[PDB]
Design a protein around this ligand. Structure first.
Ligand SMILES: [Mg+2]
Ligand SMILES: [Mg+2]
Ligand SMILES: [Mg+2]
Ligand SMILES: [Mg+2]
Ligand SMILES: [Mg+2]
Ligand SMILES: [Mg+2]
Ligand SMILES: [Mg+2]
Ligand SMILES: [Mg+2]
Ligand SMILES: [Mg+2]
Ligand SMILES: [Mg+2]
Ligand SMILES: [Mg+2]
Ligand SMILES: [Mg+2]
Ligand SMILES: [Mg+2]
Ligand SMILES: [Mg+2]
Ligand SMILES: [Mg+2]
Ligand SMILES: [Mg+2]
Ligand SMILES: [Mg+2]
Ligand SMILES: [Mg+2]
Ligand SMILES: [Mg+2]
Ligand SMILES: [Mg+2]
Ligand SMILES: [Mg+2]
Ligand SMILES: [Mg+2]
Ligand SMILES: [Mg+2]
Ligand SMILES: [Mg+2]
Ligand SMILES: [Mg+2]
Ligand SMILES: [Mg+2]
Ligand SMILES: [Mg+2]
Ligand SMILES: [Mg+2]
Ligand SMILES: [Mg+2]
Ligand SMILES: [Mg+2]
Ligand SMILES: [Mg+2]
Ligand SMILES: [Mg+2]
Ligand SMILES: [Mg+2]
Ligand SMILES: [Mg+2]
Ligand SMILES: [Mg+2]
Ligand SMILES: [Mg+2]
Ligand SMILES: [Mg+2]
Ligand SMILES: [Mg+2]
Ligand SMILES: [Mg+2]
Ligand SMILES: [Mg+2]
Ligand SMILES: [Mg+2]
Ligand SMILES: [Mg+2]
Ligand SMILES: [Mg+2]
Ligand SMILES: [Mg+2]
Ligand SMILES: [Mg+2]
Ligand SMILES: [Mg+2]
Ligand SMILES: [Mg+2]
Ligand SMILES: [Mg+2]
Ligand SMILES: [Mg+2]
Ligand SMILES: [Mg+2]
Ligand SMILES: [Mg+2]
Ligand SMILES: [Mg+2]
Ligand SMILES: [Mg+2]
Ligand SMILES: [Mg+2]
Ligand SMILES: [Mg+2]
Ligand SMILES: [Mg+2]
Ligand SMILES: [Mg+2]
Ligand SMILES: [Mg+2]
Ligand SMILES: [Mg+2]
Ligand SMILES: [Mg+2]
Ligand SMILES: [Mg+2]
Ligand SMILES: [Mg+2]
Ligand SMILES: [Mg+2]
Ligand SMILES: [Mg+2]
Ligand SMILES: [Mg+2]
Ligand SMILES: [Mg+2]
Ligand SMILES: [Mg+2]
Ligand SMILES: [Mg+2]
Ligand SMILES: [Mg+2]
Ligand SMILES: [Mg+2]
Ligand SMILES: [Mg+2]
Ligand SMILES: [Mg+2]
Ligand SMILES: [Mg+2]
Ligand SMILES: [Mg+2]
Ligand SMILES: [Mg+2]
Ligand SMILES: [Mg+2]
Ligand SMILES: [Mg+2]
Ligand SMILES: [Mg+2]
Ligand SMILES: [Mg+2]
Ligand SMILES: [Mg+2]
Ligand SMILES: [Mg+2]
Ligand SMILES: [Mg+2]
Ligand SMILES: [Mg+2]
Ligand SMILES: [Mg+2]
Ligand SMILES: [Mg+2]
Ligand SMILES: [Mg+2]
Ligand SMILES: [Mg+2]
Ligand SMILES: [Mg+2]
Ligand SMILES: [Mg+2]
Ligand SMILES: [Mg+2]
Ligand SMILES: [Mg+2]
Ligand SMILES: [Mg+2]
Ligand SMILES: [Mg+2]
Ligand SMILES: [Mg+2]
Ligand SMILES: [Mg+2]
Ligand SMILES: [Mg+2]
Ligand SMILES: [Mg+2]
Ligand SMILES: [Mg+2]
Ligand SMILES: [Mg+2]
Ligand SMILES: [Mg+2]
Ligand SMILES: [Mg+2]
Ligand SMILES: [Mg+2]
Ligand SMILES: [Mg+2]
Ligand SMILES: [Mg+2]
Ligand SMILES: [Mg+2]
Ligand SMILES: [Mg+2]
Ligand SMILES: [Mg+2]
Ligand SMILES: [Mg+2]
Ligand SMILES: [Mg+2]
Ligand SMILES: [Mg+2]
Ligand SMILES: [Mg+2]
Ligand SMILES: [Mg+2]
Ligand SMILES: [Mg+2]
Ligand SMILES: [Mg+2]
Ligand SMILES: [Mg+2]
Ligand SMILES: [Mg+2]
Ligand SMILES: [Mg+2]
Ligand SMILES: [Mg+2]
Ligand SMILES: [Mg+2]
Ligand SMILES: [Mg+2]
Ligand SMILES: [Mg+2]
Ligand SMILES: [Mg+2]
Ligand SMILES: [Mg+2]
Ligand SMILES: [Mg+2]
Ligand SMILES: [Mg+2]
Ligand SMILES: [Mg+2]
Ligand SMILES: [Mg+2]
Ligand SMILES: [Mg+2]
Ligand SMILES: [Mg+2]
Ligand SMILES: [Mg+2]
Ligand SMILES: [Mg+2]
Ligand SMILES: [Mg+2]
Ligand SMILES: [Mg+2]
Ligand SMILES: [Mg+2]
Ligand SMILES: [Mg+2]
Ligand SMILES: [Mg+2]
Ligand SMILES: [Mg+2]
Ligand SMILES: [Mg+2]
Ligand SMILES: [Mg+2]
Ligand SMILES: [Mg+2]
Ligand SMILES: [Mg+2]
Ligand SMILES: [Mg+2]
Ligand SMILES: [Mg+2]
Ligand SMILES: [Mg+2]
Ligand SMILES: [Mg+2]
Ligand SMILES: [Mg+2]
Ligand SMILES: [Mg+2]
Ligand SMILES: [Mg+2]
Ligand SMILES: [Mg+2]
Ligand SMILES: [Mg+2]
Ligand SMILES: [Mg+2]
Ligand SMILES: [Mg+2]
Ligand SMILES: [Mg+2]
Ligand SMILES: [Mg+2]
Ligand SMILES: [Mg+2]
Ligand SMILES: [Mg+2]
Ligand SMILES: [Mg+2]
Ligand SMILES: [Mg+2]
Ligand SMILES: [Mg+2]
Ligand SMILES: [Mg+2]
Ligand SMILES: [Mg+2]
Ligand SMILES: [Mg+2]
Ligand SMILES: [Mg+2]
Ligand SMILES: [Mg+2]
Ligand SMILES: [Mg+2]
Ligand SMILES: [Mg+2]
Ligand SMILES: [Mg+2]
Ligand SMILES: [Mg+2]
Ligand SMILES: [Mg+2]
Ligand SMILES: [Mg+2]
Ligand SMILES: [Mg+2]
Ligand SMILES: [Mg+2]
Ligand SMILES: [Mg+2]
Ligand SMILES: [Mg+2]
Ligand SMILES: [Mg+2]
Ligand SMILES: [Mg+2]
Ligand SMILES: [Mg+2]
Ligand SMILES: [Mg+2]
Ligand SMILES: [Mg+2]
Ligand SMILES: [Mg+2]
Ligand SMILES: [Mg+2]
Ligand SMILES: [Mg+2]
Ligand SMILES: [Mg+2]
Ligand SMILES: [Mg+2]
Ligand SMILES: [Mg+2]
Ligand SMILES: [Mg+2]
Ligand SMILES: [Mg+2]
Ligand SMILES: [Mg+2]
Ligand SMILES: [Mg+2]
Ligand SMILES: [Mg+2]
Ligand SMILES: [Mg+2]
Ligand SMILES: [Mg+2]
Ligand SMILES: [Mg+2]
Ligand SMILES: [Mg+2]
Ligand SMILES: [Mg+2]
Ligand SMILES: [Mg+2]
Ligand SMILES: [Mg+2]
Ligand SMILES: [Mg+2]
Ligand SMILES: [Mg+2]
Ligand SMILES: [Mg+2]
Ligand SMILES: [Mg+2]
Ligand SMILES: [Mg+2]
Ligand SMILES: [Mg+2]
Ligand SMILES: [Mg+2]
Ligand SMILES: [Mg+2]
Ligand SMILES: [Mg+2]
Ligand SMILES: [Mg+2]
Ligand SMILES: [Mg+2]
Ligand SMILES: [Mg+2]
Ligand SMILES: [Mg+2]
Ligand SMILES: [Mg+2]
Ligand SMILES: [Mg+2]
Ligand SMILES: [Mg+2]
Ligand SMILES: [Mg+2]
Ligand SMILES: [Mg+2]
Ligand SMILES: [Mg+2]
Ligand SMILES: [Mg+2]
Ligand SMILES: [Mg+2]
Ligand SMILES: [Mg+2]
Ligand SMILES: [Mg+2]
Ligand SMILES: [Mg+2]
Ligand SMILES: [Mg+2]
Ligand SMILES: [Mg+2]
Ligand SMILES: [Mg+2]
Ligand SMILES: [Zn+2]
Lengths: 64, 14, 149, 107, 49
RNA sequence: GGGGGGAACCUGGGGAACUGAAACAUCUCAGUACCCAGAGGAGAGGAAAGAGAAAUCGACUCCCUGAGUAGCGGCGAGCGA
RNA sequence: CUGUUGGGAAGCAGCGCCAGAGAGGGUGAAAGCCCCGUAGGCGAAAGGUGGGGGGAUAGGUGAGGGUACCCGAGUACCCCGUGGUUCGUGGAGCCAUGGGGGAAUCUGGGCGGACCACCGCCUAAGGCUAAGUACUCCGGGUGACCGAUAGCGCACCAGUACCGUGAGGGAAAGGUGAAAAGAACCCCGGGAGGGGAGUGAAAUAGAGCCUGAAACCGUGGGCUUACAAGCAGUCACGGCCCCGAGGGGUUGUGGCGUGCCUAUUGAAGCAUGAGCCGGCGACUCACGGUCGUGGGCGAGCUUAAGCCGUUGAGGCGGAGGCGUAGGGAAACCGAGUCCGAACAGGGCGCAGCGGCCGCAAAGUCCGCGGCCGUGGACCCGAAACCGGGC
RNA sequence: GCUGGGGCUAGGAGUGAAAAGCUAACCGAGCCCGGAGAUAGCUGGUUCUCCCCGAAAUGACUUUAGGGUCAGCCUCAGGCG
RNA sequence: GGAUGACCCCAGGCGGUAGGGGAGCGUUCCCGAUGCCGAUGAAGGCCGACCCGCGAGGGCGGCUGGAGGUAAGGGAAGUGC
RNA sequence: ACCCGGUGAAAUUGAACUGGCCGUGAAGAUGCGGCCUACCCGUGGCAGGACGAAAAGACCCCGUGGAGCUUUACUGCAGCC
C-alpha cells in the first residue's frame, strides 16, 4: 500500500523550499528561571538539522 | 516416522 | 524497419542484480549481506528512518510547534493562490480565474490573487485580490484590475 | 454423441495411404469406438495360434488388420472414382451421402 | 474500413488485415508493405493530428 | 407452512491470541480468526427527523478520485474518515 | 492427383485447386484441398429461462376559504453505564442503547461538533423496494501457466492404502509398438528363466516394455603392485601397452605438498556439517518512496474509474494528481515573509546556449535498474499463546 | 481386598490415601484442526564465469554490551582541478 | 597514431575476505515463425587426444536415440547447488 | 561364543594408500618436521587411541525467549461487602 505520513514529524518539522529540514530549538520548555536572556532568546529561533538527520526525517514526509 | 525412541540421559557433568 | 531491428537504446534495459548464485558472481553465499546480524536476517532491521537503537530518537527529542488541529478538523476558509504578472504574458484582452485554471496556473477551488513578480500588460484582469505591487504595476501599465468577490 | 464415420460397412473403398495404397475393397467391418475399419483383403497379418480345438496342428492364421478409418476413401458407384462425401437432402426430408466428383448417391 | 474487402484478404498467409481504427505500429512494422484506403488514410491523418 | 443440506460469497448475534509497540498494561493485531443464527442466487442497504455552508445538494448500493488529506494516537507504535 | 525415397509421406519433385475456411487436432514422419474441424450458416416436439417487444389488471393524479381533529410512546428529551464514527474523556457533538426519570402533534419536534442567540436544513419512534455490487460447487473460452519430485493431496479405482480410540493425518503409482503382428512350434527346465523359430523399420521396443543419466555390483582386456610411510595429487624422467620428431593409457623412481564447507583473532585441524549419487531446494511480487538511467512532452506534464472499438487493434475519457511562490503557529502578507518599536540585524526565500528561429532545460509521464517503507518480504527451524472441536 | 459387565466426571478443566501423580507408551497444564508462513536482535544454509577497486573489528549514544542509529573507514556516478 | 572501437604503437596498473562496480555465459518461456532445421534422423543420452573462447561455454565429428527443434535481433523469469 | 550348510540385519560412515617416538601446531597429531620402525591379505581375541558412537550440554552464561509457582511487585477480573 502507499506510505503514510509520520505525524510526529509533521507536527515538529518543516521542509523548506530548497529541501532543508527546520526545527525549533530544544531546551526552553521549562527550567528557565536561571537561564540567561541570551539563552532563551537564541532558543526561540528555528534551526537547521544536520544533513544526515534531515534526510531521514524527510523520508517520513513523503507527500509534502 | 512412527515412534520416536527417546534418547538416553547424558552423564551428569555438574 | 522490421521487427528484428527494434532495439532499446544502450542503457535502457539493464539486467538485474541476482544474489546468492555462486562464487564467481561476487554476490554469492551471503548475498551481499555480510555476517550474522539482525540486518542479515529475513525481516531485518526496524525502520532505519526512525529507530536509533533504543535511545530517544533524533526526531522525538525536538519540540512541536503551532496549531496541530482538533476534531472535527479543518475549518473551511477562503483559499487564495497567487499568480505573478509574468505568468499572464500569454493572454490578451481579458483574464479571469476560470481562464487561468484552463491554462494550468490556478488549481481549482482557490480564489485568485495577482502578484507582483513580472511586468504588467494593458489587460483587464479579474481576480479576488491584488498585491500592493501588482496593483501599482497594473494601473501604471494601462491595465484595468476589476476586483471581484 | 457418436463417432463420425464417413464410411459404412459394405460399401467399396480405396485405401489411400500406407503399405496398401491403391488397394480397393469392400468395407468388411467398421469399429467406431476405435476409429477404424476392416477392408476385405487388405492389411493382412500373421497371427500365431495355439494347438487347441478349432486350430489343431496350430501354427499361424491370416487376419485382416484394422486400418485407421481416415486412410480409406469410398469409390462412387456411378463415376467409379474415389471421392469425399457430400450430403444431399431428398424431398422426403431424409438425407443421403452423395459423391463429390459427380453427383451420384453412395447411400 | 471496407467490410467486404477485408473478408477477401483475410485468409492470405501474406496479408494482415485491419480496420483504420486499429492501425498500430506493431502490425505496421511486422509487415513489409502498407496499403490503405484514401478513407483509411484520412482517418490516419486525424489520429496523428 | 417449517425442520435438513449447499465450495466461496452475504447480513446479524457473540468474539480471541500470537504479534507490533525492538520490555508492557492503554494502544496494535482486529471486530481478524473462529463459534452460532439467518438468507439467497446474491445478501446487505434504500426514498432524508440526510448532508454541511454551497444563500447548496437531493434514495441506496458499487468503482475512481478526494487522501495517507481532515484528524485520531502511552500525540508512541500506529490508526485513518 | 501423379511420381520418388521410405516400414509409413503429410518430406522432396511435377502440374493443379479452394479460401467469409492458412484457428487447431489427427492420419505410419512434416497435409489449406484424406479425416475431425474452422469461416460462414441452420436447428427444438419437450422442459427451463425470458431483465426485451406486446397486452392486462392493481394502482395513481385539482383549487381556494374555514376548522385546529390526525400525523407512529415508556418514544423523543435529560441524566447514569457503554458501543459506533477519524474521535483512546477529549471543548465531544452526532448515531445506537442496558438503568432511572419522562413530554408534546407543526406555536409539534430532531440536526448544522459543548453551550446560547440569530440564520438555515430536515420531519424520529411501522413496513417494502429491482438494477448497478460479491462468490465460483458447476459449464465453456483463453494463457510469454505446470509437464508426472511439476501442476490440485489424487493424470492411475485417492480423500484411497496405511496411521490414529477418535477428531484427524495422509501417500506412492503415467508412456510396448504405426498395428498385438503380445512370440505357433521345437530344445533345457518342476516352474521360473532362457536358447532357437517367428512378428516388426527396429525386440539391449518382449510386456520387470520409449529415451535409459549417476551412484552401486560384475565379466573380460591393457598397464601396474607383496622392503613399502599416504589429503592420494602435481612436476620430471624412465619402462610397458595403444594410436598412427607426435599423441593417449599406466606408473617405477626423484621433487614438492596440512581435504571441502562453515564459524573464527586463529583449523589439516582432535571445532560444525556432509555415506554416495540423481532430482526438489533460498533475495520475489504488489503498491508507495528515493536516487540513477532510456525515451516523450515542456510552464507545463499526465490521466483514474469508466465508455466505444477489437477479438492478442486501438482510441476516447481532464474527474483528479504533480509542477508553475514563498514566508509565518495563525490571522495574513507576498518576491518576499517571520522575529522586532525598527528605515537594525538575522532565519527561511527570490535571478540558459548559439544563430525572432535552433539546441537545451524547470517539471512531468512511461520503461529500466539500485536501494528504502508496508506486507511472510532471502529460505528452513522453536519452546510457546489463543480459538473451536476430539 | 481383588475382579467382569454397564455408566458418570476433562484441559486452567477433571481425578488424585498427594508423587505436581494420572487423564490412550514423554503432562508444572492432553490431543487434533485452525489463527499460522506466530515471533526468533539466535544457529544453519544461499547455486554460472570473468574484469577493476577494496574495507572494519574504532568514537558517541543506546534495558545497550554477540543488536542497533550517526560518524570513521570501502565502492560507484557526476562536478571541481 | 586513424579520426570519436576499425586497428596499431608506447607507457603504467592488474594478491585479496566483508563489500561496491562492470562485462558476459547458460536455463524456461514469448516475438521473429503460415517461416527455417528435421526420418538422408529432432530433442535427450554416450565418447572425442579436434575447432573457437580468458572463462562460463560454443562448435564439429562418431556412436546411441527415434520426433521434435528453432536463428540474427529483442522481450519476460518458478533461471544455474 | 567357535567351525560347516541355510536365511541375513544395525547404528555409523567427507574421502583414506589410516604405524612409534620427540617436537611442532588453535595449547593432547595416522595426515606437519626430524628420526625410528615396518613384506601383501586375513581369522579368533583385548579395549589404550581414533579428543570413538549416541543425544544441535541438562550444568553455566547470553536472549529486553518461554512456561509452572509465590507474594504486603504492578494492573485488572470473578467472588463477596
Ligand atoms: Mg505526533
Ligand atoms: Mg511547523
Ligand atoms: Mg513553553
Ligand atoms: Mg547562573
Ligand atoms: Mg542574561
Ligand atoms: Mg523573545
Ligand atoms: Mg497530495
Ligand atoms: Mg548488471
Ligand atoms: Mg528486465
Ligand atoms: Mg543471471
Ligand atoms: Mg557466483
Ligand atoms: Mg566479494
Ligand atoms: Mg546470511
Ligand atoms: Mg544489503
Ligand atoms: Mg550473515
Ligand atoms: Mg560482520
Ligand atoms: Mg562472523
Ligand atoms: Mg552464515
Ligand atoms: Mg559478529
Ligand atoms: Mg551486519
Ligand atoms: Mg546499517
Ligand atoms: Mg521468518
Ligand atoms: Mg526480525
Ligand atoms: Mg509538544
Ligand atoms: Mg494543519
Ligand atoms: Mg429422420
Ligand atoms: Mg487468417
Ligand atoms: Mg492472414
Ligand atoms: Mg504475415
Ligand atoms: Mg436452509
Ligand atoms: Mg460474524
Ligand atoms: Mg472469551
Ligand atoms: Mg496483547
Ligand atoms: Mg505475528
Ligand atoms: Mg502479549
Ligand atoms: Mg513486543
Ligand atoms: Mg519486540
Ligand atoms: Mg517477555
Ligand atoms: Mg479493533
Ligand atoms: Mg458483527
Ligand atoms: Mg440454513
Ligand atoms: Mg446478479
Ligand atoms: Mg431491507
Ligand atoms: Mg418516507
Ligand atoms: Mg492505532
Ligand atoms: Mg481499528
Ligand atoms: Mg516402396
Ligand atoms: Mg502422395
Ligand atoms: Mg509440391
Ligand atoms: Mg480463422
Ligand atoms: Mg497448424
Ligand atoms: Mg501429435
Ligand atoms: Mg512444413
Ligand atoms: Mg512441425
Ligand atoms: Mg493438418
Ligand atoms: Mg496441422
Ligand atoms: Mg458461427
Ligand atoms: Mg459453426
Ligand atoms: Mg391539534
Ligand atoms: Mg412522523
Ligand atoms: Mg441530544
Ligand atoms: Mg449516553
Ligand atoms: Mg470507542
Ligand atoms: Mg465514545
Ligand atoms: Mg490513551
Ligand atoms: Mg484529548
Ligand atoms: Mg464522541
Ligand atoms: Mg437508553
Ligand atoms: Mg417549528
Ligand atoms: Mg420545540
Ligand atoms: Mg436526535
Ligand atoms: Mg444540538
Ligand atoms: Mg445537520
Ligand atoms: Mg438536515
Ligand atoms: Mg418512513
Ligand atoms: Mg432487498
Ligand atoms: Mg437485490
Ligand atoms: Mg443489488
Ligand atoms: Mg471452471
Ligand atoms: Mg515447459
Ligand atoms: Mg508442451
Ligand atoms: Mg511418477
Ligand atoms: Mg504427483
Ligand atoms: Mg520422467
Ligand atoms: Mg523436477
Ligand atoms: Mg517437473
Ligand atoms: Mg481432480
Ligand atoms: Mg503428491
Ligand atoms: Mg482411510
Ligand atoms: Mg491403493
Ligand atoms: Mg489402528
Ligand atoms: Mg482404523
Ligand atoms: Mg501421486
Ligand atoms: Mg504407446
Ligand atoms: Mg500403447
Ligand atoms: Mg511410425
Ligand atoms: Mg492396444
Ligand atoms: Mg519336458
Ligand atoms: Mg516359457
Ligand atoms: Mg536357456
Ligand atoms: Mg523365449
Ligand atoms: Mg528406416
Ligand atoms: Mg538401444
Ligand atoms: Mg527402443
Ligand atoms: Mg514412442
Ligand atoms: Mg530399457
Ligand atoms: Mg534396464
Ligand atoms: Mg577387473
Ligand atoms: Mg630394509
Ligand atoms: Mg619390490
Ligand atoms: Mg628431474
Ligand atoms: Mg609416451
Ligand atoms: Mg609418462
Ligand atoms: Mg612422488
Ligand atoms: Mg568446495
Ligand atoms: Mg560456531
Ligand atoms: Mg568458536
Ligand atoms: Mg586431518
Ligand atoms: Mg580427523
Ligand atoms: Mg565438539
Ligand atoms: Mg572435522
Ligand atoms: Mg557452534
Ligand atoms: Mg556447517
Ligand atoms: Mg556425522
Ligand atoms: Mg558412492
Ligand atoms: Mg545433489
Ligand atoms: Mg533485492
Ligand atoms: Mg524506482
Ligand atoms: Mg524514471
Ligand atoms: Mg509524451
Ligand atoms: Mg495528455
Ligand atoms: Mg509583532
Ligand atoms: Mg530579510
Ligand atoms: Mg539572506
Ligand atoms: Mg527536449
Ligand atoms: Mg525528462
Ligand atoms: Mg535507500
Ligand atoms: Mg504478509
Ligand atoms: Mg517472503
Ligand atoms: Mg525485501
Ligand atoms: Mg497465556
Ligand atoms: Mg495472553
Ligand atoms: Mg484449546
Ligand atoms: Mg473448548
Ligand atoms: Mg464391583
Ligand atoms: Mg468393575
Ligand atoms: Mg464399560
Ligand atoms: Mg466425578
Ligand atoms: Mg470427564
Ligand atoms: Mg461431560
Ligand atoms: Mg471435551
Ligand atoms: Mg490446558
Ligand atoms: Mg494455557
Ligand atoms: Mg484444576
Ligand atoms: Mg488410591
Ligand atoms: Mg492419543
Ligand atoms: Mg501417558
Ligand atoms: Mg506440549
Ligand atoms: Mg503451560
Ligand atoms: Mg497422553
Ligand atoms: Mg478446525
Ligand atoms: Mg497472524
Ligand atoms: Mg510468517
Ligand atoms: Mg516473543
Ligand atoms: Mg529466541
Ligand atoms: Mg589492490
Ligand atoms: Mg533507557
Ligand atoms: Mg546483557
Ligand atoms: Mg542482542
Ligand atoms: Mg554507516
Ligand atoms: Mg578518504
Ligand atoms: Mg601490460
Ligand atoms: Mg587500472
Ligand atoms: Mg602486482
Ligand atoms: Mg583482484
Ligand atoms: Mg544470456
Ligand atoms: Mg520485439
Ligand atoms: Mg508461430
Ligand atoms: Mg528440408
Ligand atoms: Mg526412414
Ligand atoms: Mg542415425
Ligand atoms: Mg535444447
Ligand atoms: Mg525443451
Ligand atoms: Mg560439447
Ligand atoms: Mg544427438
Ligand atoms: Mg509433431
Ligand atoms: Mg526462440
Ligand atoms: Mg536471441
Ligand atoms: Mg527457485
Ligand atoms: Mg573348517
Ligand atoms: Mg553361517
Ligand atoms: Mg528368508
Ligand atoms: Mg542401513
Ligand atoms: Mg580422498
Ligand atoms: Mg586413498
Ligand atoms: Mg599401508
Ligand atoms: Mg609449544
Ligand atoms: Mg602450548
Ligand atoms: Mg604431539
Ligand atoms: Mg605416521
Ligand atoms: Mg596432511
Ligand atoms: Mg601427507
Ligand atoms: Mg608442510
Ligand atoms: Mg609424522
Ligand atoms: Mg617425517
Ligand atoms: Mg621406533
Ligand atoms: Mg581383528
Ligand atoms: Mg579401543
Ligand atoms: Mg568387547
Ligand atoms: Mg578411548
Ligand atoms: Mg573412550
Ligand atoms: Mg563422543
Ligand atoms: Mg560424533
Ligand atoms: Mg535445534
Ligand atoms: Mg546447545
Ligand atoms: Mg540437548
Ligand atoms: Mg558459563
Ligand atoms: Mg537460561
Ligand atoms: Mg530487561
Ligand atoms: Mg538486550
Ligand atoms: Mg521475558
Ligand atoms: Mg510466565
Ligand atoms: Mg499458559
Ligand atoms: Mg467468600
Ligand atoms: Zn461420382
Amino acid at each position: 500500500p502507499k506510505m503514510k505520513t509520520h505525524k510526529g514529524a509533521k507536527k515538529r518539522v518543516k521542509i523548506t523550499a530548497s529541501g532543508k529540514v527546520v526545527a525549533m530549538k530544544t531546551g526552553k520548555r521549562h527550567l528557565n528561571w536561571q537561564k540567561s536572556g541570551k539563552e532563551i532568546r537564541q532558543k526561540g529561533r528555528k534551526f537547521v538539522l544536520a544533513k544526515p538527520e534531515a534526510e531521514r526525517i524527510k523520508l517520513l514526509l513523503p507527500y509534502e | 516416522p512412527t515412534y520416536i525412541p527417546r534418547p538416553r540421559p547424558p552423564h551428569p557433568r555438574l | 524497419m522490421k521487427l528484428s531491428d527494434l532495439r532499446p537504446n544502450p542503457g535502457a534495459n539493464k539486467r538485474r542484480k541476482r544474489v546468492g548464485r555462486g562464487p564467481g558472481s561476487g554476490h554469492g553465499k551471503t548475498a551481499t549481506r555480510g555476517h550474522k546480524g539482525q540486518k542479515s536476517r529475513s525481516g531485518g532491521l526496524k525502520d532505519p528512518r526512525r529507530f536509533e537503537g533504543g535511545r530517544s530518537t533524533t526526531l522525538m527529542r525536538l519540540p512541536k510547534r503551532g496549531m496541530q488541529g482538533q476534531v472535527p478538523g479543518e475549518i473551511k476558509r477562503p483559499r487564495y493562490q497567487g499568480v505573478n504578472l509574468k505568468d499572464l504574458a500569454r493572454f490578451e484582452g481579458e483574464v479571469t480565474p476560470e481562464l487561468l485554471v484552463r491554462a494550468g496556473l490556478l488549481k481549482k477551488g482557490y480564489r485568485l490573487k495577482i502578484l507582483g513578480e513580472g511586468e504588467a500588460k494593458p489587460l483587464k484582469v479579474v481576480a479576488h485580490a491584488f498585491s500592493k505591487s501588482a496593483l501599482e504595476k497594473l494601473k501604471a501599465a494601462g491595465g484595468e484590475p476589476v476586483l471581484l468577490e | 454423441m457418436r463417432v463420425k464415420m464417413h464410411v459404412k460397412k459394405g460399401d467399396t473403398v480405396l485405401v489411400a495411404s500406407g503399405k496398401y495404397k491403391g488397394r480397393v475393397g469392400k468395407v468388411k467391418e467398421v469399429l467406431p469406438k476405435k476409429y477404424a475399419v476392416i477392408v476385405e483383403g487388405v492389411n493382412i497379418v500373421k497371427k500365431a495360434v495355439r494347438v487347441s480345438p478349432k486350430y489343431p496342428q496350430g501354427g499361424f492364421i491370416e487376419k485382416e488388420a484394422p486400418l485407421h478409418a481416415s486412410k480409406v476413401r469410398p469409390i462412387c458407384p456411378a463415376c467409379g472414382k474415389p471421392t469425399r462425401v457430400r450430403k444431399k437432402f431428398l424431398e422426403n426430408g431424409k438425407k443421403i451421402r452423395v459423391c463429390a466428383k459427380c453427383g451420384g448417391a453412395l447411400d | 474500413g471496407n467490410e467486404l474487402v477485408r473478408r477477401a484478404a483475410r485468409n492470405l498467409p501474406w496479408v494482415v488485415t485491419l480496420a483504420p481504427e486499429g492501425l498500430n505500429v506493431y502490425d505496421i512494422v511486422r509487415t513489409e508493405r502498407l496499403v490503405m484506403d484514401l478513407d483509411a488514410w484520412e482517418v490516419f491523418q486525424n489520429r496523428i493530428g
